[PDB]
Amino acid sequence: HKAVELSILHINDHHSYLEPHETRINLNGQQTKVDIGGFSAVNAKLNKLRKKYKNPLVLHAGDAITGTLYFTLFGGSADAAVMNAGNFHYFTLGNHEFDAGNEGLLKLLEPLKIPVLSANVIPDKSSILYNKWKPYDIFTVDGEKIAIIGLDTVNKTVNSSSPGKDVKFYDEIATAQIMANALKQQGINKIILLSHAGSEKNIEIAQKVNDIDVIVTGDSHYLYGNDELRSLKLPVIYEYPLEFKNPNGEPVFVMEGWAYSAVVGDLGVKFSPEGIASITRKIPHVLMSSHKLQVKNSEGKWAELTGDERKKALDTLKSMKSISLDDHDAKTDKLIAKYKSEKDRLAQEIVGVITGSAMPGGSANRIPNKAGSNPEGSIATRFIAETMYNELKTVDLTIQNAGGVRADILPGNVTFNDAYTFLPFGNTLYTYKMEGSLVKQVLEDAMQFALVDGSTGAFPYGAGIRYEANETPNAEGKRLVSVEVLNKTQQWEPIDDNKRYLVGTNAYVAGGKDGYKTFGKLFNDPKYEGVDTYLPDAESFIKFMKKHPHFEAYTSSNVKFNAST
Amino acid sequence: HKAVELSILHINDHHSYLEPHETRINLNGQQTKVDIGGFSAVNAKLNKLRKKYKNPLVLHAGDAITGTLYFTLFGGSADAAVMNAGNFHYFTLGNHEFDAGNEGLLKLLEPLKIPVLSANVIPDKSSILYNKWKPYDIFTVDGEKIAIIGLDTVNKTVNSSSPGKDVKFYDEIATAQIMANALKQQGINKIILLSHAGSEKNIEIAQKVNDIDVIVTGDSHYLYGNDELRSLKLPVIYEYPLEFKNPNGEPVFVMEGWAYSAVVGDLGVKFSPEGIASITRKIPHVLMSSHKLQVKNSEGKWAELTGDERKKALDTLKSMKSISLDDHDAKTDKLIAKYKSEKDRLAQEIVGVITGSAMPGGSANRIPNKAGSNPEGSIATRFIAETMYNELKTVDLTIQNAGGVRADILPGNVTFNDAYTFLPFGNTLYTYKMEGSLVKQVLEDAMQFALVDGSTGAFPYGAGIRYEANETPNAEGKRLVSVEVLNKTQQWEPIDDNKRYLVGTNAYVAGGKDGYKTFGKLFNDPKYEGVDTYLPDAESFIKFMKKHPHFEAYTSSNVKFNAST
Ligand SMILES: Nc1ncnc2c1ncn2[C@@H]1O[C@H](CO)[C@@H](O)[C@H]1O
Ligand SMILES: Nc1ncnc2c1ncn2[C@@H]1O[C@H](CO)[C@@H](O)[C@H]1O
Ligand SMILES: [Zn+2]
Numbered sequence A, B: 001h002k003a004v005e006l007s008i009l010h011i012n013d014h015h016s017y018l019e020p021h022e023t024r025i026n027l028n029g030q031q032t033k034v035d036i037g038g039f040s041a042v043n044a045k046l047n048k049l050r051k052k053y054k055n056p057l058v059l060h061a062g063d064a065i066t067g068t069l070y071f072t073l074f075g076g077s078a079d080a081a082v083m084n085a086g087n088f089h090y091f092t093l094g095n096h097e098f099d100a101g102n103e104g105l106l107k108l109l110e111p112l113k114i115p116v117l118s119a120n121v122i123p124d125k126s127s128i129l130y131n132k133w134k135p136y137d138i139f140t141v142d143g144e145k146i147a148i149i150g151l152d153t154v155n156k157t158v159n160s161s162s163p164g165k166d167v168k169f170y171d172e173i174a175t176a177q178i179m180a181n182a183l184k185q186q187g188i189n190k191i192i193l194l195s196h197a198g199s200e201k202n203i204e205i206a207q208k209v210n211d212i213d214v215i216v217t218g219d220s221h222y223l224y225g226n227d228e229l230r231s232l233k234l235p236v237i238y239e240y241p242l243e244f245k246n247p248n249g250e251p252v253f254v255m256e257g258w259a260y261s262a263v264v265g266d267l268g269v270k271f272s273p274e275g276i277a278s279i280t281r282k283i284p285h286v287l288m289s290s291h292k293l294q295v296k297n298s299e300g301k302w303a304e305l306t307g308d309e310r311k312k313a314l315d316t317l318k319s320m321k322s323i324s325l326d327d328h329d330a331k332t333d334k335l336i337a338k339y340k341s342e343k344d345r346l347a348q349e350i351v352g353v354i355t356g357s358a359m360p361g362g363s364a365n366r367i368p369n370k371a372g373s374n375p376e377g378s379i380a381t382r383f384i385a386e387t388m389y390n391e392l393k394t395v396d397l398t399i400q401n402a403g404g405v406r407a408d409i410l411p412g413n414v415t416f417n418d419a420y421t422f423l424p425f426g427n428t429l430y431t432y433k434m435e436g437s438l439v440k441q442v443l444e445d446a447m448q449f450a451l452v453d454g455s456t457g458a459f460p461y462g463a464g465i466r467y468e469a470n471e472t473p474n475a476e477g478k479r480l481v482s483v484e485v486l487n488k489t490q491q492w493e494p495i496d497d498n499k500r501y502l503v504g505t506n507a508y509v510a511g512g513k514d515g516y517k518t519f520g521k522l523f524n525d526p527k528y529e530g531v532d533t534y535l536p537d538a539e540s541f542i543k544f545m546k547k548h549p550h551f552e553a554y555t556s557s558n559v560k561f562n563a564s565t
């Protein structure tokens, strides 16, 4: 064996973010709105870095698809096009690759020309996905063999996505070890794992599995960063990269590249003849525009910097190694212009039709049986809760706050654009696994905030759960009268205080906003298994209409609220 | 690809049976004692068949070691010698390969020149077993590649044998699929699995895992046979071989070769260009001597057939395709003669010394506090129970019947031969996982048989369990007064009716003999997880003395029995 060097360049979890998106940083001491990401910047940066560095290896760690209308309106073809233009060496399957079933994955893979790897996701012969990817590949650098193994997250995909029954999944840790062990006798001592298992599982693999040198990560969406990125108050979770020892005592490196086309990770690796990795270069490149630099003025308005203040802002960004400004790729620009124009036409098409009476929503209807409201209150909120309930086969009930719906939902045609109009906040679906007693408590919390302590927008409505409550609390301080949960037997049953339910809600109240105290306490406590699904609210609404293209409006809100009189 | 044929020749679970052993068959209508097996016959038959057939593949499916003094007195060197003389192509690790720790396995592997395979048993770098075997091998027949993958049983090895902590084990099904899946892209469509997982798990693999054509089995000790062997009333469990379809619809063949050097399995396989297996020859060869043909006469004595009756017996055996008479190999005969002579010397060596007072046993001492007995009864039986308790780290308590010990155990030197004198019945250790209430019941059963319904030899004594009982049953028909089990905290605690204990006993009473009704009912009911460990009783006694080379005799039997007066 001889020593060799590799230049790993990687992204993950772009989730159909073909265009840039807004974020906030602390620049020269002030909170500043800026634009980051987009696939034109990704491809431009990959193209420039791969020509600059010896032995580049260009990787995508999964969840190419789902998250914007660029997926929904094109079935993956837009994502395939921009990925092809980046000339990635390998792509591994994520969890969202299965969101539209085997059928949906096939539609991505057909136009995609990037080699696909996944060692623990294995289709049977009759599957439409048979022979569409391989478990590993071996490439040669300066005479040396290097293996790369693909890997997906298991439970999350099986439970929260929609793979077909003819696709078999295998344990992440076992697959990683068995794959690496088999490669040894082929004279291979340099092994890369391209894994959508998430940071937590990949860190476990690093510490429990031998013979794997680098684990390029997706699924967790973590920014692995450095002091430069910390100085901008970006959400840095870990240093780029993390380092462990495996049971044999050899170093293992683990790193992710944030999400949503925001970062190109850049890791230079030298391997000893015996295949031990060391780091020669480590840069998480944040892709940023120079054109939006907005700060909040004294009237509360976000305004562009001007004059010397703008110059100082630009100078600071230009001086940073980990910020890359205004990268753009001509080919990718052409593709995105084409898809953007098509998207604007397609988004005006009808996804479904609603018949019947208007479903009351907005501020006036937040609380049932109040002046200016109606006896059912915000039926539109129940509707939104139903769109959330429809996402996951595993979910027992969902809860949505009335303030998350800004107007009545009226009968007539519903377009893709309309869904984004109905739901302007950009929430994703978030789940907890929680006892019935806590479900009762969060409803109590929300009603208390809505009626007494805060905004009426906190008032809760659910799908798969229905309740009666009094405005006036009883002797024990409780407003709830009855709570039922739908047996997914299809009969309504009394909630069970001791049963652990899988509960879905929006990301906003999941963190405890709007007085949802109970959710606030469950957040980050692993006992409750909290997870951000990254399924956007407007997209959930679109799926619901696709399922009910001729939907008869609900006439009840799953809430009976006895107002004080 | 081209079509190719393979001639698989295999044994399994020889368990150090270098010499023939006795069995009983139904020959010409009469029960007949005959000798079968031995490694001279194995090697002779393998040698003759491999020269007769094209493309022979000669395999050993594990548990080469443990079961006779040929292991104990030689540490595996005798087994290695006879295996080497058979020129096997591959050996896979079984469960008993770890009975004497990594240290014991190393002693087998050092002299062993047969390539070793095991894909789901993987030593860490610092292990003394590092790099002593490979997960798979690829060989070429007439230009075609065929892969062979090794596999071991997991839970049984980890729990009931003694592998070191630096040896990691992986799931049988996952390993089989991941290994086979990885081999595909190397242009391999013919795959053999050499698996000590046992028949049950191998049958599951055949039905749940793709891309594996033949599974050559060890661990279960099942005779896979045919109508010829059924006619002799041999213990045929399945047809040689079994056939399944995998999830992809392709055929999979599974077969074992009984145990204890008794059978050479002979399976001719043709593979299509696409790697689909079909059977061209299927013979389970039972290796039998022509020299012992004994039937029971009218005085109850076993006597050799003579004259025309002997001739008819021989003629019947000679006419059978699946019986092979008097195979012997010159080289192996020389090895066995050498080891047999050495064994006779070594077996007279001292394994331990007992000091103190005689431990009463035999018929006179079966029941405590009876005429001709002593207040403690059969302390020697408690001793034997302790030797059983010492075998498995997992076992909570053991129970031994007093009739299983034929004499007092006196102070002084104990040799290897002495252990086989102490314990002449040839039992192995058998376990059940059973509730405390059933433990109470089996003690009640045994006492009832000993005192009223049958032989006094049924009277039970235990290790890790102690009890008080009255000869006269109470109003509820029960003799037990108290039952305690040793917390493995090292404090005695009351038995818990609802706790499931791992209970060890001998194979004889495990089947319900001697009135052990409760064990009889647990037998073959999978709820109770019954398993024959194949750990022989005399060998357990030898291990105990090795652990206590200067053992002070027990003075109590773990039983307080209040005789009726
Ligand atoms: N991200 C969000 N998701 C749902 N509701 C929101 C969000 N942001 C604000 N609201 C609602 O709007 C109100 C503030 O106008 C809040 O009380 C809340 O009910
Ligand atoms: N295989 C055996 N294991 C233990 N005890 C046995 C066995 N065979 C016979 N005995 C004992 O010997 C008695 C018959 O003499 C039985 O009642 C039983 O107690
Ligand atoms: Zn993602």
Ligand SMILES: [Zn+2]
Residues within 6 Å of the ligand: A013, A062, A063, A094, A095, A096, A196, A218, A219, A220
């Ligand atoms: Zn993901």
Ligand SMILES: [Zn+2]
Residues within 6 Å of the ligand: B013, B015, B063, B219, B220, B221, B534
């Ligand atoms: Zn065995």
Ligand SMILES: [Zn+2]
Residues within 6 Å of the ligand: B013, B062, B063, B094, B095, B096, B196, B218, B219, B220
């Ligand atoms: Zn075994």
